[PDB]
Amino acid sequence: HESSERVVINISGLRFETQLKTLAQFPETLLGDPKKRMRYFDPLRNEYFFDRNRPSFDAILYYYQSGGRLRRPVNVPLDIFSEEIRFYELGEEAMEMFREDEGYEFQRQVWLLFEYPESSGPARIIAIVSVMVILISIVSFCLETLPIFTDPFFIVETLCIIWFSFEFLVRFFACPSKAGFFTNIMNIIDIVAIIPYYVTIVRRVVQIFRIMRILRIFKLSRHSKGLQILGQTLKASMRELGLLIFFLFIGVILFSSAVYFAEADERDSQFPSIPDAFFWAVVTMTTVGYGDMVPTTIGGKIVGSLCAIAGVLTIALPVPVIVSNFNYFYHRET
Amino acid sequence: HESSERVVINISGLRFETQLKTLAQFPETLLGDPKKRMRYFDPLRNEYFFDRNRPSFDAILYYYQSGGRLRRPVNVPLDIFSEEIRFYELGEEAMEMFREDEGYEFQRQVWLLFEYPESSGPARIIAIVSVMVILISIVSFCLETLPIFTDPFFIVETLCIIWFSFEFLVRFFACPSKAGFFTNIMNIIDIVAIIPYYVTIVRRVVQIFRIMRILRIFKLSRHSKGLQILGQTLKASMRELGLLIFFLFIGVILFSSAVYFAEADERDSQFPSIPDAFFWAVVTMTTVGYGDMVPTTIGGKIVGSLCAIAGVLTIALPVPVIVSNFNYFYHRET
Amino acid sequence: HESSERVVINISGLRFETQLKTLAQFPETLLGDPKKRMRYFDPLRNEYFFDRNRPSFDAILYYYQSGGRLRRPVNVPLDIFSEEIRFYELGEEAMEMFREDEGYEFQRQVWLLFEYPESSGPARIIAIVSVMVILISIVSFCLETLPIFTDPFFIVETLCIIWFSFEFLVRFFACPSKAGFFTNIMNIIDIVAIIPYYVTIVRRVVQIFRIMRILRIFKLSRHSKGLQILGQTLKASMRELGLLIFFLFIGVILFSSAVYFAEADERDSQFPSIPDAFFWAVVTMTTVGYGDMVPTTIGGKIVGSLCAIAGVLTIALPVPVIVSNFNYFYHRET
Amino acid sequence: HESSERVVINISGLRFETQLKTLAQFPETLLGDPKKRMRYFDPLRNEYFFDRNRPSFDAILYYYQSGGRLRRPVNVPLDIFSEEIRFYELGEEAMEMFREDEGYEFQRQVWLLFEYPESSGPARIIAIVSVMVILISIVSFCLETLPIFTDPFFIVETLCIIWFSFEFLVRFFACPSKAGFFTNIMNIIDIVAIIPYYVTIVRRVVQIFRIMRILRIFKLSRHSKGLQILGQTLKASMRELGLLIFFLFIGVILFSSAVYFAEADERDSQFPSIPDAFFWAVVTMTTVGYGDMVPTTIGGKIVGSLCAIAGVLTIALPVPVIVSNFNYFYHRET
Ligand SMILES: [K+]
Ligand SMILES: [K+]
Ligand SMILES: [K+]
Ligand SMILES: [K+]
Ligand SMILES: [K+]
Ligand SMILES: [K+]
Helix, strand or coil: CCCCCEEEEEECCEEEEEEHHHHCCCCCCCCCCHHHHHHHEECCCCEEEECCCCCCHHHHHHHHHHCCCCCCCCCCCHHHHHHHHHHCCCCHHHHHHHHHHHCCCHHHHHHHHCCCHHHCHHHHHHHHHHHHHHHHHHHHHHHHCCCCCCCHHHHHHHHHHHHHHHHHHHHHHCCCCCCCCCCCHHHHHHHHCCHHHHHCCCHHHHHHHHHHHHHHHHHHHHCCHHHHHHHHHHHCCHHHHHHHHHHHHHHHHHHHHHHHHHCCCCCCCCCCCCHHHHHHHHHHHCCCCCCCCCCCCHHHHHHHHHHHHHHHHHHHCCHHHHHHHHHHHHHHCC | CCCCCEEEEEECCEEEEEEHHHHCCCCCCCCCCHHHHHHHEECCCCEEEECCCCCCHHHHHHHHHHCCCCCCCCCCCHHHHHHHHHHCCCCHHHHHHHHHHHCCCHHHHHHHHCCCHHHCHHHHHHHHHHHHHHHHHHHHHHHHCCCCCCCHHHHHHHHHHHHHHHHHHHHHHCCCCCCCCCCCHHHHHHHHCCHHHHHCCCHHHHHHHHHHHHHHHHHHHHCCHHHHHHHHHHHCCHHHHHHHHHHHHHHHHHHHHHHHHHCCCCCCCCCCCCHHHHHHHHHHHCCCCCCCCCCCCHHHHHHHHHHHHHHHHHHHCCHHHHHHHHHHHHHHCC | CCCCCEEEEEECCEEEEEEHHHHCCCCCCCCCCHHHHHHHEECCCCEEEECCCCCCHHHHHHHHHHCCCCCCCCCCCHHHHHHHHHHCCCCHHHHHHHHHHHCCCHHHHHHHHCCCHHHCHHHHHHHHHHHHHHHHHHHHHHHHCCCCCCCHHHHHHHHHHHHHHHHHHHHHHCCCCCCCCCCCHHHHHHHHCCHHHHHCCCHHHHHHHHHHHHHHHHHHHHCCHHHHHHHHHHHCCHHHHHHHHHHHHHHHHHHHHHHHHHCCCCCCCCCCCCHHHHHHHHHHHCCCCCCCCCCCCHHHHHHHHHHHHHHHHHHHCCHHHHHHHHHHHHHHCC | CCCCCEEEEEECCEEEEEEHHHHCCCCCCCCCCHHHHHHHEECCCCEEEECCCCCCHHHHHHHHHHCCCCCCCCCCCHHHHHHHHHHCCCCHHHHHHHHHHHCCCHHHHHHHHCCCHHHCHHHHHHHHHHHHHHHHHHHHHHHHCCCCCCCHHHHHHHHHHHHHHHHHHHHHHCCCCCCCCCCCHHHHHHHHCCHHHHHCCCHHHHHHHHHHHHHHHHHHHHCCHHHHHHHHHHHCCHHHHHHHHHHHHHHHHHHHHHHHHHCCCCCCCCCCCCHHHHHHHHHHHCCCCCCCCCCCCHHHHHHHHHHHHHHHHHHHCCHHHHHHHHHHHHHHCC
16 A cells, blocks of 8 residues: 555566556556455465456556556557456546547437438438439529529429428427537538528529528438538648638739739730739639630740649648548548 | 466567466467477476567467457568468468458360460460450541541451450350359450440440440450459449549539529620539539630639639549559559 | 676566666766666665666667667657656756657837737737738739729828838837848848838839739738748758759650640641740640640640640659648647 | 577577577577677576667577578667677678668779769869750750741850760760660760761651750750659659550540540531540540530530549559659658
């Protein structure tokens, strides 16, 4: 009991040696409780024997020596080291920190088919129809603006919205906490996909509410794991995502002004002002190269060359970070 | 014999210590059979001595302690650790699991030249002619549609098909299991490369059977290891491959609608409907930028800028996974 | 005292053994000073006991054996090994080398708000206005060249420069070493952003001083960490950065000459000389593909194909080095 | 002497134990020669003591046990393990294998200035003029074809060739082995840069010898390390380099035929034949997108979309291998 008396721990032939005050620091563990560890004592050698994994005990003993630092060694498998922590009984408060450091009736029945579709057969069949109603609604939306086009795009627009409403209503009543119902951004999409039609019953407003009829494409996120992974990626990459927008903003203003002063004293110049040369810089840095406007002078072609070179660089800098973020959520979701 | 009696195993000076019940778990092995291991016993120290590799034995002893877990340590070479498993005689059922976890007359003679061309000299010379008959058949197919063009493209089309038939026939008779003949997708290609001509002896059909005269290019897979590696890559990447198609599908419908509502109240607008703006989104996200259609309004250029930015991102996310899959099959095929 | 007498050091059960002349090499350390280490001596075993980390001591003892080589083992955490060096008292001259090898009143008050804006609340509020004066100055600069345009772009140009001057003046007087004031390239930008206007109070000069009114965009580097990281990246990548320019220079002259001699005997040729075909090679290698000029002959299309293939290769060679350099400064700045 | 007698080797407290027949296998080494190792024997413990590196000896002892396998451990530094091999005296034949497995008067004076320019000051000054004569020769070559142009491009063409000849002549006489003079591909370039002019003192020949006046750009490889690294990269990447050309060849014929049969029954079709649609596939897969020809039909735009998608994939597969090959030669040349 905190007395500098020395204790020898033998792990499958690997000899460990520490003070009793070090093990008495955590009395709830195996080596810390004199009653739990005595089952492993060897009175012929004055040591405790364990017929278990050897590379793991380095961190187990150091967990006592450091006072709580539980770090898996770089050569010990994750499943093996985690099973050793449960044997020596380090505790759930210590096991949780190891996982954090490692990176880790009638109402309930109708709630399963309209939320967890893998719960049963008929629960997943509804997910098929809930997808067909999205694809048909997307198809009908694009075929409205066709130059060719009772009103045959109102039978479908209203048949695609009786599902969008009847399905949204059940999820609002079969839900437990109505106050935490709006935290899930996946149901605000279900609302923004019913706001336009139900409010259509100043020209700027009728146009924008027609735009909000394009967010329905996000309703596929409920039935697509890939869109979910994409959402978590951008949400965790806002720094390098906005960093790309900022590096473009500097490159646009820089190279739009550079091509303007090199293509300003020309009758055949296509750069009348700096803002007009903005789109040229964006399509040149992104290597899109529409061809709707291209420099003609010597200095204009020099700026155009450096605009394409600096474009592929300033874009490829924050891309691998976003790609690595995506591969994390994608490989983890298995 | 399962009796808690302790056993000391000395590996080139590294001392290991376990119970006899642990080694008696696998009596067919070296340390498990009392007759096999006694040749290594030292009665002066009461231990078994082995003058072999030291870093490997950590996993060898743990294979007994865990009950079958055979995992090579991260610092032991693959060839060295595999040669240790054969010494201690863990077994073929255990060696196979280690390889799985590590990622690993007259009829027969004519079958070698027309299947395994590296079997001999004349067997590989036929592979040269079997390639020249593919290149000439591909050349003749493209020169048919030339605006310039008994019928001189029937002498070659039929001379290139007497090989395609005579060679396909021998592979059908010199083959053992005729029932498993169609499992190899490499011979269905040999059939789809004879279906059109032999069936040409409703306008929609004559056109499509003319298309099926383009799958002959896949007959090069028999003589090209690179095409084989490409086939295994796509076959193992269907998830991220289709995930790219889906992320494009969302980006197309999203940005085609965005540019349409920004380029709809314009006499000089080139976006009459959403479907017409589909191709613009694909060539902009892929940075192809044909220039056949480009926005003119302010909001149209804003959507065009974000369409090129979101294009290089949503494409570069599943690409490294496909590239890594390709490097696996390519480096392994050595 | 340099006498070959042997010393046994026991680290938590791991036995180490060395000569006394090896530890007496560094008398200022723990194991080197007989008075410091005697507190850990065990007269029953004739050894020094330490109840500390075991994987770290390999390098600690080798620091004595090699004569100063202090290299952290590949399996020991950086924070753990650094805390061991301070226990054994290797010294600050040795700790500094370990960090290098690891990769690591009234005047003062007004100097905080105009240099270290995170010092207080009002110090950071000025950084907001110091950014708004940059954005408005950039906006006003681009709206000058608009084809539409007492003089309303002089009220803003002079209101944006009273801040650019009043703020630059305080940083010159609240600065300690006026001689080392110009070493910081971030203040030469503050000067080049006041040189044009204050000197406007040979046509080639009035034009270039109008260009120098575009370097103001760099004044955002004071309030943007991302621009700072970009500056350090290019400054540390000048080799592979200029290596890209050189590989392009070879590819331009190579493929411009190749397309010229293939598109010289043509009435409809768009390549009258080698220099005119320079811009075509740059936009083709960078995959920009404006379309302002494209080959027509067979050999011209062959050169164009190889120009696009060799373009994506010669560009993607020095890019990952620049990307890796960027990820270093970006992840380190946390 | 091959007698199973056991030998204990103590490395700084780490105990090793082997048979004498194992060490007697290599009598020329330290532990193998009884006269060399006796200087380290301890008659009080019957063991050989060494006050040296501990992680290295695992492979040193296994070099005897395996019979010649000398593999550095994954945790031992390269410089430390190499210095241990020289202490135990394993031999030069064994040290060379370790390096291979690790990846590793008047005539002589004039030969230094014209081959090894870093030998002295005046030797490197000539390299500056030898570069200026290349840049001027390249500049003069491109300014010949200018539409504006005793003959002022013969004074420079001949002044740039008196250096190209006088410098080539000295390297041929100040060279030792004239038979191995043509093995260095860097001097065949010096010959192909003198072949045209000296042979100009059938129209197809005068044109091609005018082309061979473009290989002079390769004379910069003598004064540019980057071009040397690029040469070694392509020379070691011919597999994945030609693999890219082959994957393009399949994609060209595949997608050129696909767009043709979808754009053949159209008065406004721009694809009259398969070969004419070749260039469209190359510029679409490489995302160049000139815009000189673009599909119009529905199926043509479908093929165009898949041609751009399959383009960025089939190109990005063998690129990282070429990039990794380049980073090897580039980082090694330091
Ligand atoms: K392009
Ligand atoms: K274009
Ligand atoms: K591009
Ligand atoms: K383009
Ligand atoms: K165009
Ligand atoms: K055009």
